[PDB]
């Protein structure tokens, strides 16, 4: 079945709703905020699988997201987000192949990151991150996964050249309109077209533009599924034309709210069901 809808979900760590609200609401899948390091061994990998099974729920990906990451504002995720920061690069590149150890157990084919704030080409630490994207791609190639990069700052045109510095065929992008609107960077529909060839997930998540002298300065603000700037329609339309079939997986990142956190889960599902309805025929 095409479009099968998701949400995106924390064990501990992370911003996404508990499984047990992903059960209430009855999606098929969910895309998972990997556990805290202690956590995350073998045992409670099974644990997990095992409460995903019985649950009626496939895992689609599973996130990285590590200590000292702020995104309080725009120079502050540059400085402190990803595998990019020198100080705390070797302990996020071993964090995420634990993650990826911890993913396999599980069974899910896939991790995600959000690299950080790609440098420039002709950059000197460009060629270091590439070497470290590469070894961390060899890790999850000997797992049978794909990594999946969280779009970020970058333009796509910069993250295209990026992937294809990169050159490895378990290397893909999750795609999130939302974040392109919050860092204020490019039309994210545009973008989505450039990079099409790469797109193995997506996020469904909605967002404002700042004032157009404010963008990639202050921060968009993020808003309830449809009523942002994304344009859920244009979004979805465009991802059926390019070929895209997989889960549709909403974020709404307000963990901080749960009641309302779950309100807009519940209306982005019954708006997302209608558009696949239209759209996907299903
Ligand atoms: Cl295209
Ligand atoms: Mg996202």
Same mark, same amino acid.
């Given at each position: 079945?095409?479009? =099968?809808?998701?949400?995106?979900?924390?064990?501990?760590?992370?911003?996404?709703?508990?499984?047990?609200?992903?059960?209430?609401? @009855?999606?098929?899948?969910?895309?998972?905020? $990997? =556990?805290?390091?202690? *956590?995350?061994?073998?045992?409670?990998?099974?644990? /997990?699988?095992?409460?995903?099974?019985? $649950?009626?729920?496939?895992?689609?990906? #599973? /996130?990285?997201?590590?200590?000292?990451?702020?995104?309080?504002?725009?120079?502050?995720?540059?400085?402190?987000?990803?595998?990019?920061?020198? +100080?705390?690069? $070797?302990?996020?590149?071993? +964090? &995420?192949?634990? #993650?990826?150890?911890?993913?396999?157990?599980?069974?899910? =084919?896939?991790?995600?990151?959000?690299?950080?704030?790609?440098?420039?080409?002709?950059?000197?630490?460009?060629?270091?991150?590439?070497?470290? *994207?590469?070894?961390?791609?060899?890790?999850?190639?000997?797992?049978?996964? $794909?990594? !999946? %990069?969280?779009?970020?700052?970058?333009?796509?045109? !910069?993250?295209?050249?990026?992937?294809?510095?990169?050159?490895?065929?378990?290397?893909?992008?999750?795609?999130? =309109?939302?974040? &392109? #609107?919050?860092?204020?960077?490019?039309?994210?529909?545009?973008?989505?077209?450039?990079?099409?060839?790469?797109?193995?997930?997506?996020?469904?998540?909605?967002? %404002?533009?700042?004032?157009?002298?404010?963008?990639? @300065?202050?921060?968009?603000? +993020?808003?309830?599924?449809?009523?942002?700037?994304?344009? &859920?329609?244009?979004?979805?339309?465009?991802?059926?034309? #390019?070929?895209?079939?997989?889960?549709?997986?909403?974020?709404?990142?307000?963990?901080?709210?749960?009641?309302?956190? @779950?309100?807009?889960?519940?209306?982005?599902? +019954?708006?997302?069901?209608?558009?696949?309805? @239209?759209?996907?025929?299903?």
């Amino acid at each position: 079945p095409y479009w =099968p809808i998701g949400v995106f979900t924390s064990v501990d760590a992370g911003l996404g709703v508990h499984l047990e609200v992903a059960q209430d609401l @009855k999606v098929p899948t969910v895309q998972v905020h $990997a =556990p805290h390091p202690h *956590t995350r061994t073998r045992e409670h990998a099974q644990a /997990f699988r095992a409460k995903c099974d019985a $649950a009626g729920i496939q895992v689609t990906v #599973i /996130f990285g997201g590590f200590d000292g990451e702020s995104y309080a504002d725009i120079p502050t995720t540059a400085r402190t987000v990803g595998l990019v920061p020198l +100080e705390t690069r $070797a302990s996020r590149v071993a +964090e &995420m192949k634990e #993650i990826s150890d911890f993913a396999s157990w599980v069974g899910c =084919p896939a991790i995600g990151l959000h690299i950080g704030f790609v440098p420039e080409s002709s950059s000197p630490d460009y060629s270091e991150l590439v070497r470290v *994207t590469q070894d961390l791609l060899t890790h999850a190639a000997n797992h049978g996964q $794909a990594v !999946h %990069l969280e779009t970020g700052q970058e333009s796509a045109d !910069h993250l295209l050249e990026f992937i294809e510095d990169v050159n490895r065929p378990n290397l893909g992008i999750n795609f999130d =309109p939302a974040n &392109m #609107i919050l860092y204020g960077t490019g039309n994210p529909i545009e973008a989505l077209r450039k990079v099409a060839r790469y797109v193995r997930s997506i996020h469904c998540k909605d967002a %404002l533009w700042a004032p157009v002298n404010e963008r990639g @300065k202050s921060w968009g603000q +993020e808003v309830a599924l449809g009523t942002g700037d994304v344009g &859920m329609e244009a979004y979805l339309t465009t991802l059926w034309e #390019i070929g895209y079939r997989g889960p549709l997986t909403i974020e709404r990142e307000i963990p901080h709210d749960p009641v309302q956190q @779950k309100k807009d889960l519940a209306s982005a599902l +019954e708006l997302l069901t209608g558009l696949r309805k @239209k759209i996907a025929n299903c």
